[PDB]
Amino acid sequence: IEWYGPDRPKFLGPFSEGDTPAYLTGEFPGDYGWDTAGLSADPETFKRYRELELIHARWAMLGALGCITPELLAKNGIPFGEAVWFKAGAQIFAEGGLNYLGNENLIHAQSIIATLAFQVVVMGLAEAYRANGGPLGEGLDPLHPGGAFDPLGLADDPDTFAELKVKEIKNGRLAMFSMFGFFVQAIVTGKGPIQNLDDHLANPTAVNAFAYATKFTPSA
Amino acid sequence: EFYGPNRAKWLGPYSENATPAYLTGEFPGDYGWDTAGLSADPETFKRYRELELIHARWAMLGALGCITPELLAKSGTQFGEAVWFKAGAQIFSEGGLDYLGNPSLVHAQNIVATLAVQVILMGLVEGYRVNGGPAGEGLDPLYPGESFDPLGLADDPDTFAELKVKEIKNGRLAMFSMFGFFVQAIVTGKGPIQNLDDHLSNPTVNNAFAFATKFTPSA
Amino acid sequence: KKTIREKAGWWSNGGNEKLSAFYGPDRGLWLGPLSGTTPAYLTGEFPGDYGWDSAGLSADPETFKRYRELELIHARWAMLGALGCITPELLAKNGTPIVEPVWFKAGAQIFAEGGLDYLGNPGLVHAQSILATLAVQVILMGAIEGYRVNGGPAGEGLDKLHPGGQFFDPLGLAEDPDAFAELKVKEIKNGRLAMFSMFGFFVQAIVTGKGPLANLDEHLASPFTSNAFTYAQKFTPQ
Ligand code: CHL
Ligand code: CHL
Ligand code: CLA
Ligand SMILES: CC1=C[C@H](O)CC(C)(C)[C@H]1/C=C/C(C)=C/C=C/C(C)=C/C=C/C=C(C)/C=C/C=C(C)/C=C/C1=C(C)C[C@H](O)CC1(C)C
Ligand SMILES: CC1=C[C@H](O)CC(C)(C)[C@H]1/C=C/C(C)=C/C=C/C(C)=C/C=C/C=C(C)/C=C/C=C(C)/C=C/C1=C(C)C[C@H](O)CC1(C)C
Ligand SMILES: CC1=C[C@H](O)CC(C)(C)[C@H]1/C=C/C(C)=C/C=C/C(C)=C/C=C/C=C(C)/C=C/C=C(C)/C=C/C1=C(C)C[C@H](O)CC1(C)C
Numbered sequence A: 001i002e003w004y005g006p007d008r009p010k011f012l013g014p015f016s017e018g019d020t021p022a023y024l025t026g027e028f029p030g031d032y033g034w035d036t037a038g039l040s041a042d043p044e045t046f047k048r049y050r051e052l053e054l055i056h057a058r059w060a061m062l063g064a065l066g067c068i069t070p071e072l073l074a075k076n077g078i079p080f081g082e083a084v085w086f087k088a089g090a091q092i093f094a095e096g097g098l099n100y101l102g103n104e105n106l107i108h109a110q111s112i113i114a115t116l117a118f119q120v121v122v123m124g125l126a127e128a129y130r131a132n133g134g135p136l137g138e139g140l141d142p143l144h145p146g147g148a149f150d151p152l153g154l155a156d157d158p159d160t161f162a163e164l165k166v167k168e169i170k171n172g173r174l175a176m177f178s179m180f181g182f183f184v185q186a187i188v189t190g191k192g193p194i195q196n197l198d199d200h201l202a203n204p205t206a207v208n209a210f211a212y213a214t215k216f217t218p219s220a
Numbered sequence B: 001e002f003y004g005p006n007r008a009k010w011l012g013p014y015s016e017n018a019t020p021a022y023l024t025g026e027f028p029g030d031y032g033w034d035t036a037g038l039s040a041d042p043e044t045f046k047r048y049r050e051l052e053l054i055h056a057r058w059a060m061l062g063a064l065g066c067i068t069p070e071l072l073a074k075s076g077t078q079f080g081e082a083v084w085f086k087a088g089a090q091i092f093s094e095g096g097l098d099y100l101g102n103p104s105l106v107h108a109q110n111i112v113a114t115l116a117v118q119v120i121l122m123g124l125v126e127g128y129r130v131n132g133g134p135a136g137e138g139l140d141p142l143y144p145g146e147s148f149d150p151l152g153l154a155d156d157p158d159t160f161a162e163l164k165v166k167e168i169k170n171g172r173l174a175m176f177s178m179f180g181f182f183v184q185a186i187v188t189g190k191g192p193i194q195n196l197d198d199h200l201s202n203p204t205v206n207n208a209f210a211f212a213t214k215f216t217p218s219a
Numbered sequence C: 001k002k003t004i005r006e007k008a009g010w011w012s013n014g015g016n017e018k019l020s021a022f023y024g025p026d027r028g029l030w031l032g033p034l035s036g037t038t039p040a041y042l043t044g045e046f047p048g049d050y051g052w053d054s055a056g057l058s059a060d061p062e063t064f065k066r067y068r069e070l071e072l073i074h075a076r077w078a079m080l081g082a083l084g085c086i087t088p089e090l091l092a093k094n095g096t097p098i099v100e101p102v103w104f105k106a107g108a109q110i111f112a113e114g115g116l117d118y119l120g121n122p123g124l125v126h127a128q129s130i131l132a133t134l135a136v137q138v139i140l141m142g143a144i145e146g147y148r149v150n151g152g153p154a155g156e157g158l159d160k161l162h163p164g165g166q167f168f169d170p171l172g173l174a175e176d177p178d179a180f181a182e183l184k185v186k187e188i189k190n191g192r193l194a195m196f197s198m199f200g201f202f203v204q205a206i207v208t209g210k211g212p213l214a215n216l217d218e219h220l221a222s223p224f225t226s227n228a229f230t231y232a233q234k235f236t237p238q
Helices: A043-075 A085-093 A112-132 A158-189 A193-202 A209-215 B042-074 B084-092 B111-131 B157-188 B192-201 B208-214 C061-084 C087-094 C103-111 C130-150 C177-207 C212-221
Strands: none
Touching (some): A043 A158, A085 A112, A158 A193, A158 A209, B042 B084, B042 B157, B084 B111, B084 B157, B157 B192, B157 B208, C061 C177, C087 C103, C087 C212, C103 C130, C103 C177, C177 C212
């Protein structure tokens, strides 16, 4: 499987000879030929959208792992005052604050405003450095800088670099899809992802999403 | 400067390599913020500039119109419904929508006639805005002047430029603030001035995070 | 300059100035006589060109093409949907025993243990499994749309929007190029009306909570009494 060039894998498979636009040359990772809406016809808008895709992908991978991990650790024994991810933020308003792994001695956060303030300070610093560089880079690539972000050195060969780019963007698209799912099915179900999987495995035919289909009907 | 390459930018010192090649410091409010690349085409850029400025002007008027009645409300006027996100439901009251509380001023009773007159006049004026009319055959689509400058503030090009920047910046501020009005009316259910009063009463406890667990599904 | 019967619209097959109101420079525009400077890329060559690109989203010709295809496909789906969201309710108020004719509740019929009888007749489709329904549908519509986007058993070297072979123009209504050109406009206009009315169905569901024909009926009962402003205070933030 090629992942590049004209004979690359495409998002409709065999159905995909004449659907791909002329501007989606197999140059960039994850180019399956999906621009039915034509939103990436301009190469500059295409570059900006590629950056958005990759950053959303990386953030979504981190977030998928961060929503899965505490729940797994929650049933595997560990105290998690609020393990479910869509209420993990409301721990600040509890009696003992947000203890990290349940340990009252680890972080013991009590004020959300100070937490948020530090977060804006350092996130702004880091994202500005990401845009225009800084202590970990001056004129590197906006997406794959390397140097300080390859302490292991996985991608010094261009072919390994390309295949790992594809792997990155695909795990990331998977994570973005899965995070969208987390959102919609938290709103719909009101339970965690792991508990949704457990319930689906307990009764797959009558514990699926269609059980929550008549939930949002107006009914006067 | 607010123009040219050495202009103020959206990330300040960390903004040298964060601006696209097409965002030359030609147009007001160009801080170099097109991370999404939505204005790469100059024509789409022009249309988006018009949308920005019109949203800005409408949002300035609306910000003033949501702040003013509430101020006047505690300052001593009754205002059957002073809060802005229920100011429209006055038509369904007993005496209709009295402007400053005065039953003698407007005394509107029918919302469909109000709306009909509004569509009439608004369509006429917005079509005149797009292609001109009694107040301008072929003037700039954004800064026509010549009847929209009875005071004559912007006959000098430099004053014109700086007032353009002031306009678009007050307008971006108002658009941000109007978005805030929306989200925090939906979240809080109270007016903007009352939200400020409550924040000033106890800033550390009745900020937005007090309403954070409001939209949790909880099965 | 003409005679009475040509003014009255007689003599079909006199149509080359009747495309002038839907194609070309001096056509009908989105604000009519109050839309002067149409976007230069909206030259009047495509059906439904009223000069409306206020947001400049179709400035690139290729994304304009993609948006045209999106528009027409949405239009066709919305026409089918607008017809299908009113046919069951009309048929039920005429007397067909449909168990839930309201469209935003029509999907919940498959969870009743009598199944999803089509016209309320158990001898008909009688679907019980929503998952099997969805699987059948996914297989069929995937094949169908993949055939649409590149070609398939119903013609491969055809247009992406108006294939018009013997499978999609089997009545030959569009063999006259002028009839074709004006039928394109009729298609896109009925379809834009259907898309607007389907947005209306969606909003009238989320807001009103009744059926669309029920809304029509309660509006025709006493219009000024009952309107969309009746439900204006419904989304009050409490
Ligand atoms: C030939 C068979 C084949 C078919 C039919 C498809 C079809 C698809 N592939 Mg694809 N692929 C196929 C082969 C292959 N794919 C891929 C690799 C990929 C990738 C990497 C991706 C795809 C994606 C897609 C999707 C893009 C179209 C879309 O977004 O649907 C849009 C239409 C719908 C979503 C309609 C909904 C369908 C369903 C009936 C929904 C149910 C309706 C709900 C009840 C409605 C809810 C009600 C609400 C409103 C209240 C689509 C499902 C993309 C994707 O996953 O996006 C989603 C994508 O990223 N494919 C490979 C490897 C080379 C293939 C090998 O042959
Ligand atoms: C070097 C420091 C510096 C930093 C970090 C920034 C940062 C920013 N400036 Mg900038 N500026 C900076 C210097 C300067 N600025 C300006 C002039 C301007 C202007 C005129 C504007 C900006 C704007 C912006 C923002 C654009 C990116 C954005 O939209 O945020 C995106 C990132 C976030 C929104 C993160 C949010 C943080 C927080 C954690 C969110 C909370 C999460 C929620 C709880 C989750 C939501 C819950 C959901 C589920 C409901 C960004 C915050 C723009 C702006 O105000 O947009 C908002 C803007 O219009 N700046 C000048 C004058 C020359 C500067 C001088 O140094
Ligand atoms: C790969 C990602 C992924 C995975 C593994 C799951 C897994 C699950 N989801 Mg989530 N979900 C996802 C993505 C995902 N979802 C996305 C993207 C959305 C937004 C559309 C949702 C929205 C959603 C809702 C609203 C609900 C679930 C629910 C569920 C559970 C029951 C399955 C169900 O009802 O299907 C629903 C699946 C979807 C709506 C779309 C996902 C599309 C899949 C990945 C592709 C089809 C694969 C499938 C095996 C092929 C079936 C063919 C045919 C039958 C159609 C199950 C644990 C339900 C739950 O909590 O039950 C306990 C529930 O209420 N999900
Ligand atoms: C391609 C194409 C083509 C054509 O042309 C057009 C179109 C169609 C348009 C296109 C498409 C597109 C799409 C589909 C998109 C999607 C997106 C997404 C899903 C995202 C996500 C995204 C996602 C994401 C970011 C995510 C993220 C996450 C995160 C951060 C997390 C966080 C967290 C966590 C951990 C948990 C805790 O407790 C808390 C919090 C804080 C919560
Ligand atoms: C720049 C950029 C860049 C990159 O690239 C991309 C992106 C990101 C996309 C971008 C961004 C954008 C944005 C942010 C936007 C925003 C907007 C807004 C906020 C608006 C508002 C807007 C706003 C507005 C209009 C407002 C308005 C208002 C009004 C009318 C008012 C009215 C009223 C009032 C008085 C009150 C009373 O009782 C009633 C009423 C009737 C209610
Ligand atoms: C032009 C322009 C210009 C400037 O520049 C910019 C702008 C403004 C942006 C633009 C505009 C645009 C627009 C307006 C759009 C719209 C759209 C729509 C409305 C769609 C719908 C759309 C719609 C649609 C698809 C619909 C569809 C439907 C359907 C499928 C149905 C289905 C069904 C039925 C039968 C019933 C049953 O029981 C169920 C169901 C399942 C429900």
